[PDB]
Design a protein around this ligand. Structure first.
Ligand SMILES: [Zn+2]
Lengths: 97, 53, 146, 225
RNA sequence: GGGGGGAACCUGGGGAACUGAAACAUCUCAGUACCCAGAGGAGAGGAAAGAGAAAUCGACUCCCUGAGUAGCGGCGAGCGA
RNA sequence: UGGUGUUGGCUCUUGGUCGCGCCUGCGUAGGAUAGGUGGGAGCCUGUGAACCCCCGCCUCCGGGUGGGGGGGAGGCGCCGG
RNA sequence: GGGCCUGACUGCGAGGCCUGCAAGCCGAGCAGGGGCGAAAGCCGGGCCUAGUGAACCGGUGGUCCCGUGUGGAAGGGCCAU
RNA sequence: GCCCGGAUAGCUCAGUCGGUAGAGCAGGGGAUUGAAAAUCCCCGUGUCCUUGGUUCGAUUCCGAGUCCGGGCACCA
């Protein structure tokens, strides 16, 4: 999925590592790797609809930065943002970042 | 070399350092072997107990 | 997520109180419905010096609950619809009641505060709770006709 | 639901609040309302399994400050030991025919000790045993210095043993002891027990330490305090 | 103001296999080829939440040495500061 | 597919964790139902008696268990067994 | 067949056999400390030639050799296996 | 290797939270039946795997061991 609108958390290219065998730490002879495959770790993006400037706005933001959004919305109250449209509203809220 | 003739160790019950490894048919002698063996640590012969290998 | 109770709640407390509930309830129910506010330093600054304001508008909730309470307790609500001998061809919710007091009776109440758990589909008299203020049971009898 | 002389004892005690090694020793005497010198008791709950055949807590320590209890030692010994057995505390020696002197019913003794030669004591043991009287050198009560053994028997030597309920039990003295008389009594009770732990035990060796008296109420006290 | 082009050079996102292991999966090939994005005459880096042991130095970049060294490795091939 | 996030409120019920509160424990013998360990020669009731009645538990059916009433100081205790 | 005993040893090893290597093999003798026998002497498994498997990885017992600034510890080494 | 499961009548299995080793299957016999049968009545027989310890006694409770079964892995 695309970037996080706040954190910019992108999908990363991780290497799924199918390991095997008992661990040396548990006396095992060693963690024999059976195979290594590329994959992608996707951010936990969500859609977040918010009524700002009498306008409902949706952010594809990571799960972590959800409350950061509401931080932004509350901060927008010291802004004169109406009657802008949701495009300009979203741009300006991005500017508050 | 078998499950009935198992391996085993021989520890000096003075030094407590396993100084001898050997075998026995648990069938034949199902008791702990014990032998005056030379403990290298003790630097003197001593009853060495059959400690499980 | 500490939130500032802006009003009394059946399982949260009352205005001025600051509880910490899971984010779903406050941020999906409370924040939208303004029943609470997050616990920012900005809020905690104006927490006091607005507690007086919060309980001020609370008392406005009370006094309005009375002055309109007896305003709309002493009457009967009528509902002309299309319905059958044991059934309604249509259906009614709190919104139709708001049209009832708005156009028919002229008095202005709130649709949301009126509790309508199921949109009515039968005829006759029913009693409704309005409760504009917590612990303010404003009964109301409604009639549905054809 | 108790005796009004004891219900008063129930009233002047604080159940959940935890006292000190000295604080209940004040309460232990003021709770001494029985019509005789009650016995101070430290029923310190052990953290050990008796069902385990490894945690056999049974030892002894001679409490100073006396005990206030009456101890008559039925010592058993031979080979010149009857002399030193009769002396140094034991009143019933001896020293070989007291066995057949057991009826049983000749239970006019408060303690029994024996030198390791006897020997002929354990067999004759079966009724002398189950009432906690068989001579055993586990905790003090056996040895060829039997009279010397009995010398400290008079000197507040309380024995302690785990029970089936994981508890250990021994009085520090009668309910006539001052708190700093019991202060060395109590702390001697904790110190000896801690020295006799069956090593290898789930967590603490002691659950709690309560202090009651003969017909007296319990007391919540903090051990090692 | 941007667009798009620019021989190579450069970061950054992606990223092989052939190949070696005398097979081959880990591994190596190699983060290489190549793709995309970004510029630039360079780029990148860059001013210690460092290094590493001296209580020592004092951003960064590059050349030599360190050194095939320490190490990593089906402790193999090899890789390797 | 289970955990977790997104993801909340409301109840209802059940399995564990510790709170305590209580009751439970019966070979014979032994007065009787003896859970063990310690201390115990004493308890105790007008911070109302053994008695007798009523109320519930258990009951191994003899009783124990507790509560209410009259009664409301006579029963219990090592010792006897 | 009986008596006693555990040398079915420690540290080693002159020397040789065989042999591409590696492996395999035999061994006086030396010291330690013992068994046997009076002693001389023998005993470093079995009358012998088959009963077996390199290294790596890891286990377990000892050693205290290393222990990443120091002390420990992690962990490794070495011996045994 | 780690985990746990049981060792009981000829068998299966009960099994005390320590007072007793038991239910049925098998066996036999009696009645029973034309046979087969079933049924029925009654007897059958155990260190309660071994060692221990505790408590008056321990099948029980327990420490060990063995067998025993399974699973859970790891394999230089
Ligand atoms: Zn030794």
């Amino acid at each position: 999925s695309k970037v996080c609108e706040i954190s910019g958390k992108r999908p990363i290219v991780a290497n799924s590592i199918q390991r095997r065998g008992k661990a040396k730490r548990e006396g095992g002879v060693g963690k024999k790797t059976t195979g290594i495959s590329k994959r992608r770790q996707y951010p936990n993006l969500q859609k977040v609809r918010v009524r700002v400037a009498g306008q409902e706005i949706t952010f594809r933001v990571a799960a972590s930065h959800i409350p950061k959004v509401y931080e932004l919305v509350e901060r927008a109250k010291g802004l004169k943002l109406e009657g802008l449209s949701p495009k300009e509203i979203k741009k300006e809220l991005l500017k508050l970042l | 070399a078998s499950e009935v003739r198992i391996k085993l160790l021989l520890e000096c019950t003075e030094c407590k350092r396993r100084n001898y490894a050997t075998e026995k048919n648990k069938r034949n002698t199902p008791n702990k072997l014990e032998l005056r063996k030379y403990c290298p640590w003790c630097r003197k012969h001593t009853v060495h107990r059959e400690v499980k290998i | 997520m500490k939130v500032i109770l802006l009003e009394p709640l059946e399982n949260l407390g009352d205005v001025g109180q600051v509880v910490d509930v899971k984010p779903g309830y406050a941020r999906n129910y409370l924040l939208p419905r303004g029943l609470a506010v997050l616990a920012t330093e900005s809020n905690l600054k104006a927490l006091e010096a607005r507690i007086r304001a919060q309980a001020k508008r609370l008392a406005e909730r009370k006094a309005e609950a009375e002055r309109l309470k007896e305003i709309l307790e002493n009457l009967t609500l009528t509902i002309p619809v299309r319905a059958g001998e044991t059934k309604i061809y249509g259906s009614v919710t709190a919104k139709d009641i708001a049209e009832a007091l708005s156009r028919q009776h002229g008095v202005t109440i709130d649709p949301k505060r009126l509790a309508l758990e199921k949109p009515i589909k039968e005829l006759g008299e029913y009693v409704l709770t309005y409760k504009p203020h917590p612990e303010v049971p404003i009964q109301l009898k409604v009639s549905v006709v054809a | 639901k108790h005796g009004k002389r004891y219900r008063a004892l129930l009233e002047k005690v604080d159940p959940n609040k935890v006292y000190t090694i000295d604080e209940a020793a004040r309460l232990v005497k003021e709770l001494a309302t029985a019509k005789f010198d009650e016995t101070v008791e430290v029923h310190a709950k052990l953290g050990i399994d008796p069902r385990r055949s490894d945690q056999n807590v049974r030892g002894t320590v001679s409490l100073p400050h006396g005990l206030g209890k009456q101890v008559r030692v039925l010592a058993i010994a031979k080979g010149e030991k009857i002399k030193e057995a009769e002396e140094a505390g034991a009143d019933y020696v001896g020293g070989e025919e007291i066995i057949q002197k057991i009826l049983d019913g000749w239970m006019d003794f408060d303690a029994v000790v024996a030198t390791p030669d006897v020997g002929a004591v354990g067999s004759k043991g079966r009724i002398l045993g189950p009432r906690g009287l068989l001579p055993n050198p586990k905790a003090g009560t056996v040895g060829f210095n039997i009279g010397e053994i009995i010398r400290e028997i008079k000197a507040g030597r309380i024995e302690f043993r785990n029970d089936k309920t994981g508890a250990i039990h021994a009085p520090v003295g009668k309910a006539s002891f001052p708190p700093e008389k019991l202060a060395d009594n109590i702390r001697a009770f904790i110190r000896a027990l801690e020295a006799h732990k069956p090593e290898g035990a789930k967590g603490t060796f002691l659950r709690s330490v309560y202090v009651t008296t003969t017909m007296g109420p319990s007391v919540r006290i903090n051990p090692h305090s």
